[PDB]
Amino acid sequence: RGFVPQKEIVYNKLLPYAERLDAESDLQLAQIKCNLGRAVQLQELWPGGLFWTRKLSTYIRLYGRKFSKEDHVLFIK
């Protein structure tokens, strides 16, 4: 697809509804990029910056990484 995943969780492919998880997790990652890059630019650290930090964490509890090598570096930096 549009990007190369980088060590997903294997156990998401084995679900009965694994066709849906591709279109879902691409939307959630897009929202995390959008409203984390906005939130740091806005310096909305308590209700917004620490929110989408907490939602990026549960993106990795759920989906593994599933973001680019180019975009893994951006979250790290």
Swiss-Prot record:
Belongs to the BLM10 family. It is found in: Cytoplasm, Cytosol; Nucleus; Nucleus speckle. Signal peptide: none annotated. The chain holds residues 24 to 100 of 1843 of the full protein. Homodimer. Interacts with the 20S and 26S proteasomes. Component of the spermatoproteasome, a form of the proteasome specifically found in testis. The bromodomain-like (BRDL) region specifically recognizes and binds acetylated histones. Disulfide bonds: none annotated. Associated component of the proteasome that specifically recognizes acetylated histones and promotes ATP- and ubiquitin-independent degradation of core histones during spermatogenesis and DNA damage response. Recognizes and binds acetylated histones via its bromodomain-like (BRDL) region and activates the proteasome by opening the gated channel for substrate entry. Binds to the core proteasome via its C-terminus, which occupies the same binding sites as the proteasomal ATPases, opening the closed structure of the proteasome via an active gating mechanism. This is Proteasome activator complex subunit 4. It comes from Homo sapiens.
